[PDB]
Design a protein around this ligand. Sequence first.
Ligand SMILES: Nc1ncnc2c1ncn2[C@@H]1O[C@H](COP(=O)(O)OP(=O)(O)OP(=O)(O)O)[C@@H](O)[C@H]1O
Ligand SMILES: Nc1ncnc2c1ncn2[C@@H]1O[C@H](COP(=O)(O)OP(=O)(O)OP(=O)(O)O)[C@@H](O)[C@H]1O
Ligand SMILES: Nc1ncnc2c1ncn2[C@@H]1O[C@H](COP(=O)(O)OP(=O)(O)OP(=O)(O)O)[C@@H](O)[C@H]1O
Ligand SMILES: Nc1ncnc2c1ncn2[C@@H]1O[C@H](COP(=O)(O)OP(=O)(O)O)[C@@H](O)[C@H]1O
Ligand SMILES: Nc1ncnc2c1ncn2[C@@H]1O[C@H](COP(=O)(O)OP(=O)(O)O)[C@@H](O)[C@H]1O
Ligand SMILES: Nc1ncnc2c1ncn2[C@@H]1O[C@H](COP(=O)(O)OP(=O)(O)O)[C@@H](O)[C@H]1O
Lengths: 541, 712, 372
Amino acid sequence: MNEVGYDDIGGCRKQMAQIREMVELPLRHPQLFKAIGIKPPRGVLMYGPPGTGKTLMARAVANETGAFFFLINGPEVMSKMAGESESNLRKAFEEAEKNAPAIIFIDEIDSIAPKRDKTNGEVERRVVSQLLTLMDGMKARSNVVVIAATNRPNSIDPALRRFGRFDREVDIGIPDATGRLEVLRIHTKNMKLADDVDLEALAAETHGYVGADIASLCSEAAMQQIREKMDLIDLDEDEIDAEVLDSLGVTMDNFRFALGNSNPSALRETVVESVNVTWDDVGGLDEIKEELKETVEYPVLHPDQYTKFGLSPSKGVLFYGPPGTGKTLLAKAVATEVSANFISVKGPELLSMWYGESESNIRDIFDKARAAAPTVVFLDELDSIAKDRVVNQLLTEMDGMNAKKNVFVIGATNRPDQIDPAILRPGRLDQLIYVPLPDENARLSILNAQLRKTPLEPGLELTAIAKATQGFSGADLLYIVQRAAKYAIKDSIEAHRQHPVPYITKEHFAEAMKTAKRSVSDAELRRYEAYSQQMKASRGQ
Amino acid sequence: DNMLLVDDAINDDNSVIAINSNTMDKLELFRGDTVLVKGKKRKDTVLIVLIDDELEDGACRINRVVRNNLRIRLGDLVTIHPCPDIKYATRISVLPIADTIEGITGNLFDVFLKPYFVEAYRPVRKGDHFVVRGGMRQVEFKVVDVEPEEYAVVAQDTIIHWEGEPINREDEENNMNEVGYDDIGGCRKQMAQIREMVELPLRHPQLFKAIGIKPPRGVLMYGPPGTGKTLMARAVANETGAFFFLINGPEVMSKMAGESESNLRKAFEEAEKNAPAIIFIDEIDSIAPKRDKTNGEVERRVVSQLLTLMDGMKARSNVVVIAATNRPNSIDPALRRFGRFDREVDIGIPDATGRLEVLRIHTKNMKLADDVDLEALAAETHGYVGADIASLCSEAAMQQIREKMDLIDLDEDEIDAEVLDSLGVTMDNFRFALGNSNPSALRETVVESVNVTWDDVGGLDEIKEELKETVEYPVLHPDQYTKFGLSPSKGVLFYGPPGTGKTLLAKAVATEVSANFISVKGPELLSMWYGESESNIRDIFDKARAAAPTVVFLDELDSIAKDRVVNQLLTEMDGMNAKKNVFVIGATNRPDQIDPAILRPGRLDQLIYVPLPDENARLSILNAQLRKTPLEPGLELTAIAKATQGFSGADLLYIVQRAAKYAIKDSIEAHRQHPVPYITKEHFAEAMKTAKRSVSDAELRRYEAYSQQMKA
Amino acid sequence: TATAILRRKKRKRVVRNNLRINNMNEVGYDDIGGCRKQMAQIREMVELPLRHPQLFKAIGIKPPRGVLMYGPPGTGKTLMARAVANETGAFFFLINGPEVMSKMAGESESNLRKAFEEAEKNAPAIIFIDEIDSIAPKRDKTNGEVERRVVSQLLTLMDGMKARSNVVVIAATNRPNSIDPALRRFGRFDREVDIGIPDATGRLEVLRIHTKNMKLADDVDLEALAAETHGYVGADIASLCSEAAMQQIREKMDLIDLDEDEIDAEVLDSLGVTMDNFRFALGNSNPSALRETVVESVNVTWDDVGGLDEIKEELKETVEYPVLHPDQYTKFGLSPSKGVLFYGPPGTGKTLLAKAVATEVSANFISVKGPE
Ligand SMILES: Nc1ncnc2c1ncn2[C@@H]1O[C@H](COP(=O)(O)OP(=O)(O)OP(=O)(O)O)[C@@H](O)[C@H]1O
Ligand SMILES: Nc1ncnc2c1ncn2[C@@H]1O[C@H](COP(=O)(O)OP(=O)(O)OP(=O)(O)O)[C@@H](O)[C@H]1O
Ligand SMILES: Nc1ncnc2c1ncn2[C@@H]1O[C@H](COP(=O)(O)OP(=O)(O)OP(=O)(O)O)[C@@H](O)[C@H]1O
Ligand SMILES: Nc1ncnc2c1ncn2[C@@H]1O[C@H](COP(=O)(O)OP(=O)(O)O)[C@@H](O)[C@H]1O
Ligand SMILES: Nc1ncnc2c1ncn2[C@@H]1O[C@H](COP(=O)(O)OP(=O)(O)O)[C@@H](O)[C@H]1O
Ligand SMILES: Nc1ncnc2c1ncn2[C@@H]1O[C@H](COP(=O)(O)OP(=O)(O)O)[C@@H](O)[C@H]1O
């Protein structure tokens, strides 16, 4: 089937706009580049998690442009008899050239131009050389745009990423809540949905799902509805009752069951994501909030002042403090303020990179950060690695960056002494910041925020609980509220079984807090404070 | 009113079915009318209607030949419809069955068929059979071909062709696979999952048109070898009735370079042009293994061709691809994504009932002796896959033949018929076969089922209640959790003295929610650490996801919690959907020695101390263990329970086993002296004299001190 | 009934020679000794499916087809295979491993295909794939593409063979683990036989079989030679006899003039092997089976070890009763113990205790020294 217009896409305004401004104008309005006398870029390389719609984007752009389209699949081209792949490539390219304007989509290019390390096969070398020769010779040709789709940027051969080749790069990230809502609406434009559908609620619940996974979710929900209504349908009879066939209707419980039986995998690797956390779900640390605002917002939102004064913006920041203090939320808020993408790299990912068993690599992470700039790279629990190949690679990557690009590296840890002294030199993660435990007002704000999604008995003031939880990390308060909810649900289920309990009660909170604990021991807090004092004395003239 | 009872037809016509007069009235038929009868699976024919008053309402009479043709027995149910469009076969070719022409000479046509086709007008259909009594013998014939097709009537104008080779009766089943659902036992959930995704898109394709969705295409079954994956796929394909094409793995990977792609392409296009169809790719891993294994150009071009063909079919509908292998992490990962094997299915070793069903299915033709207690076999035979059960049956039969060999003479090529009629397999043969059997499914992690309740776990009632709260409520009442918007806890951890009853506790937890149970002992963890095992943590969690809900049990977690293994485990745990009911339960003896990283929230955080069994627990364990052993009447276990302070479950098991050993020693000594059917108290006294605590007080106090420190 | 088949020439002075009572093949069961149990197993698995197929029709089962023999090289695997094949008198197709592997690329699959097709056409048939390890080594051992084509072709032919066709496949390989794992599943080489080095009586039988034509001097004590030879495989015994004859002829060569092509008839008729020749041959010979772990019977009773009566009784209770009287254990439902661990000062005779335990239950003994 064809005619997949822009109306069949959602949640990808930025990348679609980039690809459109990069493809349409050279073909639709070549006279502009003649009037301004430049050479429009040819190569375009889209890469992102599998199933994000890269091929769908390419097809939509091709159809909307109304230009000759020629599809080349890496697998099928690599499946031909020896010496036939080169002939197929030469044909495809000549046919595209003769029918200008044209667009070429080399889908899964990584399968025909893999990393030079894994190109031991002679035929692989021949095919890669043929592709390189074809692309190099194409510069004479006009009105021909080549689009390549690959899983990761570090899998293709390095030789394919130079001027005159796939230079322009696009990074596809997982969609946000609005994107997921749009995907659901686009996919569920034909299903016989029931009245009680809350697509907004589904989008809120489903996190980390890519468009393909959402389509699978819709298919599974429809399958669940069919299975439920199968009791009124007999397999033996060839004919199907018209009314029963029409009576089919998808309900919310079907979608929840489909979510239960789903297997998302995009989050398994580092992926660019968008966040919308403001300075409202984070309480306290007002001085730190203001300092981070000054550090990040002004260089991004107000670059003219820095240009006037010649200041060089700080590259990265480092956070240290007791665990459970909300460093990740602070980083997300910082990313939100500058309205930039966010990349997260937990410690197990760093260990996997150290052992070289995960596909992704530090170089790939920073390449994706550059492609999706502005971004915010977040390195959690660095102390797990700064106990070094990985550290040296990270230092080289950090030193070799364009200061103008808005790439900020934010490191989190609990052992600032255990971090390598090299990482703290100027031009690197030198700006230290301590994250103290929440104060009474901070604890009250955290409790109130965490309870916005749970009914409460009227008059249940949390001030007493906040005051009775001095020195408690936010995670401990989350645990206390979770325990109270568990007690309440247990009581509700018991009452129902013996049969009431529509909301939590104060006595539930009292019982839950009767068995609470302080996550951080006093000795660790003393050492943290001692190190903070030591750092202050070194900058406290 | 097309459902009727089946009865034996007294008459001797292969194409006559009798119906009650009221039944005839309901269906609006006339005497002598020909009607089409469809039985089990896709077998159907046409028979001449007869009126018989003696027949009860909703009943019909059909001889054994019709029953064999329709794959039904006496009293079964069929669907009957009028067949007024039946024409007269102008030209029919039929050949006799080889076993029915044993010593028969002359013009078989005139001798047998001609009296059988003298204005008989017997309805015929492709592939049918009919027996005719000629002279003093009976000869069977088969409907090789008919014109016009398919169903017609043989009349005088018809031209009968009796020229052709004899039809051997063996190859109808030996060379052809016609196996229905009746040949599968011990796996019903898997069969339901496969059927609801194979039959529904094909038998009823209009439903998905009505609801406006594209049903999933690919399906990937996997499990231990010999679990019947091929048999299940064959049965589903035969029941569906669609054109079934098989693409064996080694068969396609054992041909000249550049021809394997041709075979794959031919198979796929042929299936495409005969929709609906089923394409079964047996042993997928043989042709598309993990990248690290295959490096030559041919074994990569084959994979590329397979991927291209698979991606090219999602447009066309009514075609589904079924694969098969033994591990999810034994094929190229590129095959597992949207549009390529969306659905995954895991097949595990059957439970006791499944093994009993398999034994019943296999041992339906053997000349079993009277003293057969297949229930006892099922109880004893644990970890045996269906193939191992077939091997057990074959070995038992071979042992029976060997025993009877004394009454046989190796010379000549025939045995006395009396000797053949005396072939009876007894229980001793089955026990010998069990002795010589070598099951190997358990050598690697597999999914099974458990049937342990809150009966074999004495004491620690509060622990039972806490486990119930943690596990059952999220699964049984997820609506309440949604109402409170709280995600259920993922995993739990148990710590305490060794041999205190943790494995059976995890089994009980899994049983309560009625979820499968995957076990991973310490040696498997070490083997995965050393990279000499065919399994991997990713594989374990993938199988757990496929068989969800499941309980993944990690025993002796301290041996490896001293790393790559811990990193992989942590990554798999974190990258787990919250809603999916995959609970990870760990056991250890050194809680401090366990890496702190695991004990963080969102992981194996909820710690539980398993205390040493007390007097009541000791009494319950003693009663449970002796549930299958005669005891001296009047024995009192209270004194033993009182005297067994500090003894864990393993210690009591050792005491009981030693007492039984002494009892059997005395029994055998008395027997040889030629009585001792019970275990006397003196046996237990001797065992106590030669038994002691397995845990020093130092370890107990250290564990209790650590528990108190955690409590504070 | 451990055998039940062995209890009762070669399908055949002039009359006796004709009735058999360089190509003298069709070696019968008489030409084998010291491997009675393995020969019984092979016969039970080969003859009955072919000679008397109606038994399995009557009882309603499919007889097993895959038989795989493995043991130390030189123990006579090919000898047993050929003996059984010729005795059964069925279409016998013989496939060598190295011979098939020596063909050009692409001509080593067609040979297997035609072999199996012919065996099917002329059923009943026996196919003996000698040295299967050469055409199906371990998966990691060989990565060559042809080495995978051949193995896959073999697997496809084997799986497709399973049918009513009366064709039995027999394979041999010195190392049980060398064969590809995929060849040892259901519908393939499932039944396995292990060949162990012979014992004293087996060695005597082999010696008598080989030393039946030599002009042995009347002063020969074959019993003494059988006793002395410990760990000698059949091939080693044949080499021993050949070397003894060589020594005898070398000693007699003094009277022989090599210049003359012929030799005096009287000297040629005076040849005779003496006991000292066998002693010298034993001195020269060198067995090789003991280099690797093998299976050999032992015949030590509770008389070559003194004392340890309490330990003897404990070992009896541990091992002997379950094997001899499993019925009572089944009655009581208590499974027997698996292993035991002897500890004590060195040289106390632990190995003798192990051998005595093995002999009491009439079970074969496997040994693994520390260096192994
Ligand atoms: N906005 C969207 N983003 C992502 N997927 C979408 C979107 N809208 C619809 N989809 C559906 O999601 C699935 C994406 O599959 P698609 O083949 O386009 O992804 P891909 O991983 O880029 O493909 P390829 O295999 O060609 O590299 C399709 O079902 C598409 O219909
Ligand atoms: N319910 C059952 N489950 C498992 N095996 C069964 C069952 N019923 C019968 N069997 C027998 O078990 C054996 C299963 O062999 P089968 O070839 O199906 O195994 P498999 O491991 O799926 O094969 P492969 O992967 O080689 O195609 C056959 O003997 C089959 O007859
Ligand atoms: N009972 C016996 N056991 C062992 N060897 C015997 C026996 N009787 C004779 N021999 C001799 O032992 C040698 C066995 O040779 P054979 O080729 O069978 O050995 P093999 O190592 O099993 O062979 P291969 O692996 O090459 O097929 C021959 O000399 C044979 O004559
Ligand atoms: N404003 C806040 N200040 C402190 N802790 C918070 C705040 N908001 C949430 N938290 C708690 O901290 C968690 C955020 O993760 P965080 O504590 O940063 O993890 P980590 O310390 O491992 O980086 C929340 O789940 C909650 O328990
Ligand atoms: N509730 C129980 N607590 C302790 N032991 C028990 C209990 N119920 C039964 N047992 C017995 O205790 C023995 C100890 O072995 P097992 O339970 O496997 O210990 P572990 O799993 O702790 O290593 C079991 O064989 C079983 O017979
Ligand atoms: N009753 C016995 N106690 C100790 N040694 C014995 C006894 N009978 C024989 N031996 C001798 O013990 C030797 C075997 O040594 P062994 O105990 O196997 O060494 P190790 O203890 O290192 O295994 C033989 O040479 C044999 O002569």
